[PDB]
Amino acid sequence: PPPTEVIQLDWWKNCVLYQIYPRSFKDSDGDGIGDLKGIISELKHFVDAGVDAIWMSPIFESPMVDFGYDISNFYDIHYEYGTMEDFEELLDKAHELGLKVLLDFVPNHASNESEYFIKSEAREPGYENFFIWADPLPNPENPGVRLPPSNWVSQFGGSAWEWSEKRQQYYLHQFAIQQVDFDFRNPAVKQEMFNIMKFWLDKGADGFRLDALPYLIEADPADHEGRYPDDPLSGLTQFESHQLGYTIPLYTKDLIELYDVVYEWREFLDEYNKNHGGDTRVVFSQGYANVSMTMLYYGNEDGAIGAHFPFNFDFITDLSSKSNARDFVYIILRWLTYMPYGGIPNWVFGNHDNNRMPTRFRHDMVDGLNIINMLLPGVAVTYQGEEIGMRDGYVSWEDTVDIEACNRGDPDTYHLYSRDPARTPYHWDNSTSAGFSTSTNTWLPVAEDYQEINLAKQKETARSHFKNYQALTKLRKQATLSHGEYDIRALSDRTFYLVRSLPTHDTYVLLFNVSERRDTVDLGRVPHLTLPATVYVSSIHSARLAGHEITSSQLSLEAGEALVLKAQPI
Amino acid sequence: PPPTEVIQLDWWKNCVLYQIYPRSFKDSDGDGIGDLKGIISELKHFVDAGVDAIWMSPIFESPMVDFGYDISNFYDIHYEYGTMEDFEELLDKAHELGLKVLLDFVPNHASNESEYFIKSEAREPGYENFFIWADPLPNPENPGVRLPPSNWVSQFGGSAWEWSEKRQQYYLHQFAIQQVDFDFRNPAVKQEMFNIMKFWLDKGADGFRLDALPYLIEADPADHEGRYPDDPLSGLTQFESHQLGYTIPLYTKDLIELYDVVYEWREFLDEYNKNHGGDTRVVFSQGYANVSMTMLYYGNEDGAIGAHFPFNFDFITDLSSKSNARDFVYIILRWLTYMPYGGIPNWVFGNHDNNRMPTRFRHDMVDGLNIINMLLPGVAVTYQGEEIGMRDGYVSWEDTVDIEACNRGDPDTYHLYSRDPARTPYHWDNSTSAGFSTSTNTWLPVAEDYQEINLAKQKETARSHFKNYQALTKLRKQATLSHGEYDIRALSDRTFYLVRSLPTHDTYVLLFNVSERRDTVDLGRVPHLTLPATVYVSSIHSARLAGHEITSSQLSLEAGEALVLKAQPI
Numbered sequence A, B: 001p002p003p004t005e006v007i008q009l010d011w012w013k014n015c016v017l018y019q020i021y022p023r024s025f026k027d028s029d030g031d032g033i034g035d036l037k038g039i040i041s042e043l044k045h046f047v048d049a050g051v052d053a054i055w056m057s058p059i060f061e062s063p064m065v066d067f068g069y070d071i072s073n074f075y076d077i078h079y080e081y082g083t084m085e086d087f088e089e090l091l092d093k094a095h096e097l098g099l100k101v102l103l104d105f106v107p108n109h110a111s112n113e114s115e116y117f118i119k120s121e122a123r124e125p126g127y128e129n130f131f132i133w134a135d136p137l138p139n140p141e142n143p144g145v146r147l148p149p150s151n152w153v154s155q156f157g158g159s160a161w162e163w164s165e166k167r168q169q170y171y172l173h174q175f176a177i178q179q180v181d182f183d184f185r186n187p188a189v190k191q192e193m194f195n196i197m198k199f200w201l202d203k204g205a206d207g208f209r210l211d212a213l214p215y216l217i218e219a220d221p222a223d224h225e226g227r228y229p230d231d232p233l234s235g236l237t238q239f240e241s242h243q244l245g246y247t248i249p250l251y252t253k254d255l256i257e258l259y260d261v262v263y264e265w266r267e268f269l270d271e272y273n274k275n276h277g278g279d280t281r282v283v284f285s286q287g288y289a290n291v292s293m294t295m296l297y298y299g300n301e302d303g304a305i306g307a308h309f310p311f312n313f314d315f316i317t318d319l320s321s322k323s324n325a326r327d328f329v330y331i332i333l334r335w336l337t338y339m340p341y342g343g344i345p346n347w348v349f350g351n352h353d354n355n356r357m358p359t360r361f362r363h364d365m366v367d368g369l370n371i372i373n374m375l376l377p378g379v380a381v382t383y384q385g386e387e388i389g390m391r392d393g394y395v396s397w398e399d400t401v402d403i404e405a406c407n408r409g410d411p412d413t414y415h416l417y418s419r420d421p422a423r424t425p426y427h428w429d430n431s432t433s434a435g436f437s438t439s440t441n442t443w444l445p446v447a448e449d450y451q452e453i454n455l456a457k458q459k460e461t462a463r464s465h466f467k468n469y470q471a472l473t474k475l476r477k478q479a480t481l482s483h484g485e486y487d488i489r490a491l492s493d494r495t496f497y498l499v500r501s502l503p504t505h506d507t508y509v510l511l512f513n514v515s516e517r518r519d520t521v522d523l524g525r526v527p528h529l530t531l532p533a534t535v536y537v538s539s540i541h542s543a544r545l546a547g548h549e550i551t552s553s554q555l556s557l558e559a560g561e562a563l564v565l566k567a568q569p570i
């Protein structure tokens, strides 16, 4: 029978979404800092790679305490990265190449250098209640020793409460001292968030990543006899009272009221899209939470609609080099089992907040992991460098600039916390500073392996991570990946299959030996696979090349080996 | 295309396995205690129910501290239950009726009234090292102040170490003070377990349940400078030093050496089956552990073969009335994802150690839960009472006899620990004591609801839990249930499907609304379902009767409603 026709999906339902970390992508001006003119000079890379949409880590005005996540002006561009004119040029050139562009910001908090905070601290009319301000806890026993409002612990270590001498109250910071939590029960705060989003959509952004949403709302002291309630204690002996893990965040994380804010954002965005037309503008939410709390970002049982999707961190939080094939299958099944009917799945293997994909897994698993990302239903998310298999770079204590590591760590522990190894500059080629900069003095050190692992090398060599990346993003154009069913099971502790199938269309099969040992499997166990089948993609050290035919039902896979097979339609 | 011939499976691969609790099954002699003549009198019940194999909770000589799991003679029958001749009669009549009969015992420990312990405490030759005996922990601060060997906590509260005045040493008890842990590094103890198994296999037993296996082996002092190492502390404020949960059982539970004992037991059983022929004799292992530690009971990487299966307690540990249809699917997929290839899956919904199935879930979910048990691949495990939807019985503090409750509990807390509510006498009919006994003086109180919930009532009335149970055990003779594939997914937060399919054989489909609300689903989402299809079984509260034709692809299911549909072969 002739192949069935399929209805085209809206762009966000099956895009390849690439995360740029602008500070480390491309330095155009020799200061060792990535910049917007740098990104503009390499927009063609996303077309070459088969990326549909780029998001940037923050580029708004920021003192850079948390490299952009401490925003002092939500309406202008950080000078080290360029100007508003450069951003507008980036949007125009990206759109001309057919790319979508999303911006990133963290609604939860503003820099203490923001006009909001300066004015709030001054109790300026309209701003007095813009942030969470509290009096000290009455000390009737030592009237003279000042007590914080509650025992709340910051994500970045120490008390979540910072005394203001000027205002003679504490302000809340779930993150850095310099990152002040907005009061999301203040209508003026909610209106300012719509104002920011409308400003950037009007400039032409295609949507937003909205960061750190579990932390929006904290217990209302009206419900606790006018005090901020203590979070319950963990009782874990490895944590002292200034260490993250000392408290259970009952009153400070994943409060149900946060979701009302997200549903209100979605209603705003839906109105905006109705009144402007063109490509749908979207919101993709970030939060690390349990399955229940994460799925609530999609919407709820009462018909609320939230983010276009919450990001799926399962490959970061629940899989690693310790995982066997059964773990891989059981964790892949979690998002697919719990995600609401009609929701769009997404898959995230890395970001600027976690160690790089091949460092969390193994170097010989890069191709298999990128195949899982591209062959699962829904949206593939790629973190800068995954398309060439970048590894964590070495960063000394002396070179560490991550506030999270400076705050929580010391020269012996800092590696437990630092995100800097996943932020080292991108490897374009084997030139000075891996082609990232004409300068040797980069804001973070260039990883030692850049002569071995760089894009130019992988475009010249017959087989490479990047060429496999290109073959996979191209495969996503096939109806079997955009509209096909899925079946996933383990064949052994070492190997699993993923089958995409769709009547009258080619079948595609992943086989992946995720173990450190060779494995032999019976392909007769794989549903919808008739032999002979053809190798479409293989891992760079596979004995099988693309175009190789699989004729035998007995297949030996090397440690880390992955194959994509193209088989006849069902 | 005429139905394919399937190869008949060995009996233990797809049996319906029924756990009898002899003390609460049937009292023949009016002492309010269930007994072997009582079981003999009702063996036809298993044939009527479509049960293939019965296991009895322990019937060996026991002081009854733990109602038979404290065994004082592993080679003879507890007097209250009957004689060795009653047991030989039971085995004879059961085998005549085509039933398999398994015995239960707990290798970990013997009664302190056993000859083993009395001789071991007396340091008789050969017995000295039968149990774990330890010196007090040396006390350099004040020599001769008596300290226990370690901080280890018993499962039934207090220290796992009991001082013997007679022997001037402590003995290990992971369970009650009266349950003494064997030394499983002693070859004479291992030889004694082979002797015990050989004795009962020689009498005609079809196999064993071996209880409490995670506790067999504890840390060897020879690996900790000649002391028993402390278990790590949990840090949890709700647990004092005498309370289960105070410690993390690093050195006392799930030691990798316990699995070598299991593999040796299978090698012995394999040799016995080979030398005796007839029907395979089996071992089913018990242990509550994580999925890692649970699957090693089947066997290991190196090719060790263990129990025919370990019991799957997921419907007790990981699902309850709090669970939605997505939880059901995600937990059902756990065993099927993790079990080794060739493994036989099994499904346990209750036992004498946990609250009854309708009490853990809801009264209106009984049929749906019995359908899952019978329609998933592998072995269905039934606990005495589940075939009629028995609810937990009320048992006051005054009537409580469970050592776990007496030791861990007080008049206000005892309900958190007691297993007595799941051990109340079986509801045969609406006669005195529900037909369990001619006496009103029963060893536990008969539940208040026996007039409403009894077997005789359910065999008379047109629709019942028992008639559904019978319809389900009959359905397991169909090739689709013994050899069929499975597919399982959630349609909503409320409803899931399970499809058993097998080309040329009929398709069977469970649809189950596990929620408290009506749900409407689209049957066109269910694979291998062509309409019309026939209701084969329905929940007793369903508007649909068996024989009812589903024609519409839109289906509204009431809270708790489950249907089994019979549909055309694929």
Ligand SMILES: OC[C@@]1(O)OC[C@@H](O)[C@@H](O)[C@@H]1O
Pocket (backbone or CB within 6 Å): A184, A185, A186, A257, A258, A260, A261
């Ligand atoms: O608009 C609904 C609501 O729940 O949204 C989150 C907070 O702004 C709450 O004060 C507010 O009532």
Ligand SMILES: OC[C@@]1(O)OC[C@@H](O)[C@@H](O)[C@@H]1O
Pocket (backbone or CB within 6 Å): B184, B185, B186, B257, B258, B260, B261
């Ligand atoms: O037979 C192997 C072994 O591991 O079995 C379990 C224990 O009896 C151990 O002492 C013994 O070495």
Ligand SMILES: OC[C@H]1O[C@](O)(CO)[C@@H](O)[C@@H]1O
Pocket (backbone or CB within 6 Å): A155, A211, A212, A213, A286, A287, A288, A353, A404
């Ligand atoms: O460590 C960085 C922290 O900030 C976040 O982005 C907050 O959502 C998370 O990655 C983590 O809690």
Ligand SMILES: OC[C@H]1O[C@](O)(CO)[C@@H](O)[C@@H]1O
Pocket (backbone or CB within 6 Å): B155, B211, B212, B213, B286, B287, B288, B353, B404
């Ligand atoms: O509550 C009883 C205890 O004994 C066991 O049967 C041992 O495996 C478990 O049910 C529990 O740990």
Ligand SMILES: *[C@@H]1O[C@H](CO)[C@@H](O)[C@H](O)[C@H]1O
Pocket (backbone or CB within 6 Å): A066, A069, A070, A106, A175, A179, A211, A212, A352, A353
């Ligand atoms: C989300 O927000 C936190 C706090 O501002 C930042 O540190 C992360 O990098 C960002 O992804």
Ligand SMILES: *[C@@H]1O[C@H](CO)[C@@H](O)[C@H](O)[C@H]1O
Pocket (backbone or CB within 6 Å): B066, B069, B070, B106, B175, B179, B211, B212, B352, B353
């Ligand atoms: C398994 O073993 C324990 C300890 O003897 C007992 O209490 C349980 O009832 C049994 O299943």
Ligand SMILES: [Ca+2]
Pocket (backbone or CB within 6 Å): A108, A174, A181, A182, A215, A216, A217, A218
């Ligand atoms: Ca907040």
Ligand SMILES: [Ca+2]
Pocket (backbone or CB within 6 Å): B108, B174, B181, B182, B215, B216, B217, B218
């Ligand atoms: Ca033991």
Ligand SMILES: [Mg+2]
Pocket (backbone or CB within 6 Å): A026, A027, A028, A029, A030, A031, A032, A033, A034, A035, A080
């Ligand atoms: Mg620059």
Ligand SMILES: [Mg+2]
Pocket (backbone or CB within 6 Å): A353, A354, A417
């Ligand atoms: Mg971290």
Ligand SMILES: [Mg+2]
Pocket (backbone or CB within 6 Å): B026, B027, B028, B029, B030, B031, B032, B033, B034, B035, B080
């Ligand atoms: Mg009796």
Ligand SMILES: [Mg+2]
Pocket (backbone or CB within 6 Å): B353, B354, B416, B417
């Ligand atoms: Mg219990």
Ligand SMILES: [Mg+2]
Pocket (backbone or CB within 6 Å): A487, A527, B487, B527
């Ligand atoms: Mg299928």
